Symmetry: none
Subunit: 387 residues, 3 copies
């Protein structure tokens, strides 16, 4: 097996879990970056936490029978070689497009990470190590990690880590950043872009800037699922965009449920995809979304990793630590010349457990009273803060 | 035994009846202004209407078991004292915040008002009387009332009285307005505000600006209702904002039914509110709503006041007059530095109107035809006139 | 019968069929221009296509019993007379307004248009022919047609034909344009215009410039439908704008379902319309829309026309063709002095069969894959591609 297939299967399982909490909303995430950071953690996880992460990341399909566990480092020889060669394939330079993947881990000065684990991080993901004091200055370390992410994403992802996400309890933060900017194989003419209505539902429609071009494009029409897939290649044909468009507005739902790595392999088969003379209408796209994947990872069977029984002894034998916050951010912009996209996956670990915080992230009742008169000046039921 | 507690009780009694007409919708109103204006009308009511208003406003508990009619003015000595001292309390001048309560009554020049009732209006509510001709220039009187209310709300509540609210047959209007601009005790840093999802339902979410700060705040954890209340004091601690947030979204409904003056007094007890170091997240709020309380006040028990059996001898002894329209507007804006809030309550008497205008202030279809040929050149449906 | 009545009935049928896909959205379209272009095409059809077009255009009512087809050129004498006299009616010079109806057809050089059909176009629609090379320079043809449309609409409708509409397959294009600039019978004083809230819904409202004037106006009040109609005549009383408005906002929906040519005839009756002293508030309006009426016309009953079985023998004796696209655009601006309005309707005839586009106009699943690694760099669902 390959780790690209693990990324695919994880992508679609995670999408099935994610869509249930974001109905009628835009979704965007990077399977590769999430899988890469989660494998960084998977190397350190041992015993039941490691097997859980292995089944969730689908790295169990990668290892051949025999020579598992710390055959080379952290994981088996198969997963090790797969990780290394994928890092090499992604980081290969190209004059046509720009594509970068960087990994960095920040650690507390007091908390000592295993030198073997740091060396394996340098070997597999060639990620650097910085030592910052979280206990004394957590917010400054947050700002530094955020500036590193911002510069690694060419300023696309600013202020990745939310305020208050890290606190003096956090003792290590594993983060990565993927950035891609390319050009279309067949570009869209700037003059051909005009205003076109876009049907959000059958009832309502909103105007958007639609780019148009006519040419030979790979289209695969799946009638069993009532949907067509269009491939728009980029410069050099090493990266491609796939648009899975259901024939009708009502069909998309069905598609979301039936999509899978197996089904996708059938649909994107080189035989199934047909170069035809097509008129292509593609809208200007700008999608930015940031998620907290802790609940999603737990719902997928990664319960031990966030539990106080997490065995991450492969990272640091001194004391014990566990993961508490896994943040992900994704940005994608499609325009006429090409597209610019950028993602980041952050992970912070710590032994401590905050009992409570007071976060107003769902509807409530608010009350404003005059304390001397003990009278209610204002009372309200807030469902949406801003209409 | 105080008008503040009466305002609390009437607040929740009115919330329970108002919530049925605004499902899945923001709610906001000011109990202090509503009960001030209802006491304004209560002073004039006598016999059955006055007892109804006293029970619904909960001024019966304010008066001790002693003389309650004709004493001081209109009501008992106890209610008179409570009115006067709350009026003095919230109109207290403070350099820290701005809090203003204003009352004013408009009357037809042909309509006669008793001098003792006007002297009482100046005594307790310190409000002025303005004589305008409702029968001749009802629209002009409406615009004048809205301009006065706008100036008293510092431009926040503009065009308060809807068109057709006031009528030429209307005898006497009673209005009041509260404005409060204050700053937080512990402010929110502008840089700490970031975009965060807000979960309207379990499956739906929308992004909002969320201000964060870590500090010592007063929180009470009511486990019986599975809910937590947080207090944010303003400058000098004379006013504070209470956020009642259920632990889960679906619990909100339950809370809205179980909340009451007694339960609010239980939950916000000094022993229950504990000072704790909390991470606090609060969304940018801009909640603005206008209501017609006539139906709700009738449902609450004030049936005679809106019916032709309304006796208002203390208001106008020459001829009887009944109220038929009660409007109420409330606006609340929460930001990082502080908050700005403003409310108004409007009262109308003896209303009826027919035609007189063709005002196009709501969506409509339009037709443009060629009269010689009787052909439709243009047809359309206008919701937004300008884009 | 009269083609004005046909335009009215078709207008309301089309409104019924069109409003279903445009809820909470502005609508505007020209019945006269659409019915004129469709009558142009209707002269060229025979057999079932012609009868279908006649039913949808309601020209079957114009023809008196007897001498229905080929009596005049392509149609009955009654329909021919109606067409010619209507052209003369709305293209009548006047010093009070500017009203123009222009029609023009572009054809491929290799396409052999029947000369008698061209003579009919010149007789009944005053339509000139231009020969353009679609197969060798379709984009130049589109630019020329857009420039002609723009000049005929006095610069209101620019870039009328969207890219991709025309292509080397299109063989003929019929386009007409209506323009009308006029002044009110009773003008709006600029000083009387003030900023007034426009109530889109009951609780949310956006501010709009509102002109005011008082005087004698023709208003009809229909209580059975809970709505009033106001007639604002333009200069010289030859064109008038009708504004029908429900008393409550919620009534509007009902109105849109119950409006009809017969009900409109009832409501705009001379005895129903009454001159009365009225205050008139009317907002500034700038309403522009553009539609593709292929689906709407097919749903009304023009199935054979857009199918490969379309008989357009009256246009070309050889190489029979069929319509592919029917684009329409409308613009209206109402201000104090008067009004400026303009529409265009263009239909392009072609010959195709299988689906020839990959139009991305509804939410879709997109993914960006690294082909060497076969890993998904990005995956997402988008419902709206802009924020």
């Amino acid at each position: 097996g390959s780790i690209g297939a693990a990324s695919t299967e994880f992508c679609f399982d995670m999408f099935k879990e994610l869509k249930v909490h974001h109905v009628n909303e835009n979704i965007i995430y990077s399977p590769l970056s999430i899988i890469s950071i989660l494998s960084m953690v998977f190397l350190g996880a041992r015993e039941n936490t490691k097997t859980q992460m292995e089944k969730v990341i689908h790295f169990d399909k990668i290892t051949g029978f025999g020579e598992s566990l710390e055959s080379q480092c952290g994981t088996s020889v198969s997963v090790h070689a797969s990780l290394k060669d994928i890092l090499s394939e992604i980081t290969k330079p190209s004059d046509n497009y720009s594509l970068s993947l960087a990994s960095k881990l920040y650690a507390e000065e007091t908390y000592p990470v295993l030198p073997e684990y740091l060396q394996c991080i340098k070997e597999l993901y060639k990620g650097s190590l910085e030592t910052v004091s979280f206990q004394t200055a957590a917010d400054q370390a947050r700002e530094l990690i955020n500036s590193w992410v911002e510069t690694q994403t060419n300023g696309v992802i600013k202020n990745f880590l939310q305020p208050g996400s890290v606190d003096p309890q956090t003792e290590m933060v594993l983060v990565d950043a993927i950035y891609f900017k390319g050009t279309w194989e067949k570009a869209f003419k700037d003059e051909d872009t005009q205003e076109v209505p876009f049907r959000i539902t059958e009832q309502e429609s909103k105007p958007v800037q639609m780019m148009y071009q006519a040419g030979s494009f790979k289209v695969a029409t799946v009638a069993a699922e009532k949907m067509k897939i269009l491939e728009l290649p980029y410069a050099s044909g090493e990266l491609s965009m796939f648009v899975l468009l259901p024939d009708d507005i009502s069909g998309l739902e069905q598609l979301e449920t039936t999509i899978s790595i197996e089904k996708l392999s059938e649909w994107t088969s080189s035989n199934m995809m047909e170069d035809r003379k097509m008129k292509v209408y593609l809208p200007h796209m700008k999608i930015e979304e940031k998620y907290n994947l802790t609940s999603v990872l737990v719902a997928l069977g990664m319960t031990d990793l966030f539990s106080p029984s997490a065995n991450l002894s492969g990272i640091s034998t001194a004391q014990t630590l566990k993961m508490s916050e896994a943040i992900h951010g994704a940005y994608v912009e499609i325009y006429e010349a090409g597209s610019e996209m950028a993602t980041s996956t952050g992970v912070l670990v710590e032994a401590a457990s905050v009992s409570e915080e007071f976060r107003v992230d769902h509807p409530f009742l608010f009350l404003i009273k005059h304390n001397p008169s003990n009278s209610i000046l204002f009372f309200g039921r807030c469902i949406f803060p801003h209409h």
